[PDB]
Amino acid sequence: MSDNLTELSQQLHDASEKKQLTAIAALAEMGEGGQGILLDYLAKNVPLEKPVLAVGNVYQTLRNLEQETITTQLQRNYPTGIFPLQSAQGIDYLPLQEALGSQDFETADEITRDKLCELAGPGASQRQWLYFTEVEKFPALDLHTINALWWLHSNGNFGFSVQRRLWLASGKEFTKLWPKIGWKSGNVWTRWPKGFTWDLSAPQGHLPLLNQLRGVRVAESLYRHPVWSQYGW
């Protein structure tokens, strides 16, 4: 047992950020010894000064074991998660992190729409859509925090940064991007969203949702926002 653990541990620490995930999955299933190695790795790499996907996968893989002991220990040691919940405008992202850590993407998606409205300010509360002019004025730090959380808790498959990359690969053509991320034309709402896939079986880039009731302008403004380049997304 010790041989594999040592090998797995060495992979987790030193292999390329491509083979780390493989070792994390195996360690999780190596009982207390493997989970212990995962826990020590977190302790040595948290809090994060930059989003590091392996750290998010280590934390989330441990949460996904759904063991009271492990979850409780993680709550005690990382009460606000593994990424500083920074805001430039007094926004509280703890409930968003908590929903993501519990893998409740539907609630995380609702909280995220509520936070973008909170950021937009006055007369956006409870609104089911943003205006592109509100998006252009969002602070970069908050969008970085929101995106980092989505990304770190979805093995890098969810997040506006992911949508933006697919958008760039689509030649910036929304008609090609939408089928790629699973947002069917005409599946738009005025009161509540329906027909989406609020779990990881969804396509890469599927969440967070951007209502297309008003067309592509808000998404374009968001993907063109300076935060992505600014923070290396």
Residue numbers in the entry: 1 to 233
Sentences from the paper on this structure:
Analysis of the plastid-to-nucleus signaling activity of Mg-Proto in Arabidopsis thaliana led to the discovery of GUN4, a novel porphyrin-binding protein that also dramatically enhances the activity of Mg-chelatase, the enzyme that synthesizes Mg-Proto. Although GUN4 is not essential for Mg-Proto synthesis in vitro or in Arabidopsis, GUN4 is required for chlorophyll accumulation in Arabidopsis under normal growth conditions, GUN4 binds porphyrins in vitro, and GUN4 stimulates Mg-chelatase in vitro. Here we report a 1.78-Å resolution crystal structure of Synechocystis GUN4, in which the porphyrin-binding domain adopts a unique three dimensional fold with a “cupped hand” shape. Biophysical and biochemical data support a model wherein the hydrophobic “greasy palm” of the GUN4 core domain, formed by helices that comprise the fingers of the “cupped hand,” wrap around the porphyrin molecule, potentially shielding it from the bulk solvent of the plant or bacterial cell.
To better understand the porphyrin-binding mechanism and Mg-chelatase stimulatory activity of GUN4, we determined the crystal structure of a GUN4 homolog from the model cyanobacterium Synechocystis sp. PCC 6803 (hereafter referred to as Synechocystis 6803) and refined the three-dimensional model to 1.78 Å resolution. The crystallized protein (residues 1–233) comprises the entire Synechocystis GUN4 (SynGUN4) protein. The SynGUN4 structure was solved by multiple isomorphous replacement using crystals soaked with methyl mercury (II) chloride (Hg) and potassium tetrachloroplatinate II-containing compounds. The crystal structure of SynGUN4 reveals a two-domain protein linked by a 12-residue loop. The C-terminal domain, which we refer to herein as the GUN4 core domain, is the conserved domain among all GUN4 family members. The C-terminal domain of SynGUN4, the GUN4 core domain, appears to have no currently identified structural homologs, as indicated by a lack of any structural matches from a search of the DALI server. The helices adopt a concave shell shape resembling a “cupped hand” on one side of the domain, with the back of the “hand” facing toward the N-terminal helical bundle. The buried surface within the concave section of the “cupped hand” is highly hydrophobic. In total, this structural design forms a cavity that is hydrophobic in nature with a volume of about 5,000 Å3. Taken together, the NMR data and the crystal structure strongly suggest that the porphyrin binding region lies within the pocket formed at the intersection of the α6/α7 loop and the “greasy palm” of the GUN4 core domain's “cupped hand” region.
